[PDB]
């Protein structure tokens, strides 16, 4: 399922509620087209991979999450598991989300 993180509070809780399944985060800006342009994919995987958890973050309204993750280029895909980080990669590459997810699945 998908989950929107509007505050660092929902961030950690998202990982804790994610259980043990993979967790890919999409640090995209709702006001920036190029980032939101990849939503028909990242958010789409929600129905193709109901076994994976997908999160969302607003680098502008949630600078608290981007601040701790020190994001400087959107979209930034960050992978977490059990509250721990395992990998990450930015740059518009929706096809990689598949290879990366099937990697640490």
């Amino acid at each position: 399922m998908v989950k929107q993180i509007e505050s660092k509070t929902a961030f950690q809780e998202a990982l804790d509620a994610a259980g043990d399944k993979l967790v890919v985060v999409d640090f995209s800006a709702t006001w920036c087209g190029p980032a939101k342009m990849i939503k028909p994919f990242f958010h789409s995987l929600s129905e193709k991979y109901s076994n994976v958890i997908f999160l969302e973050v607003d680098v502008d309204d949630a600078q608290d999450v981007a601040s701790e993750a020190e994001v400087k280029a959107t979209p930034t895909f960050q992978f977490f598991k059990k509250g721990q980080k395992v990998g990450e990669f930015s740059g518009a590459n929706k096809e990689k989300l598949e290879a990366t997810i099937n990697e640490l699945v």
Binding site: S28, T30, P34, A35, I38, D58, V71, T74, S90
Partner: peptide
């Protein structure tokens, strides 16, 4: 307003 850094989505390639 809500602006931060550059969006290197399908902007770079």
């Amino acid at each position: 307003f809500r602006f931060r850094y550059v969006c290197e989505g399908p902007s770079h390639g």
